[PDB]
Design a binder for this molecule. Sequence first.
Ligand SMILES: [Zn+2]
Length: 90
Amino acid sequence: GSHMEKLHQCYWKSGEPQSDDIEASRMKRAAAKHLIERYYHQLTEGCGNEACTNEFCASCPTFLRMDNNAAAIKALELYKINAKLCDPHP
Ligand SMILES: [Zn+2]
């Protein structure tokens, strides 16, 4: 299924007759705080993927990565733009 069908918002102060998609958006964007945490973890550790093909990750096979401090800048920078978060899967 859809982990996130489409991301968009106007304001969080939606004290008006808004759509059903509002409660659906706020639950899936509630993960966006931990998205930053998964990003910072990905930019320092990486992912267990050989076919990663993404510089926005420490385990980038032919590509570059950023230092722990530079990863702190890059983590929330990748969260807002919704970059490729592989994340190390079990
Ligand atoms: Zn990766």
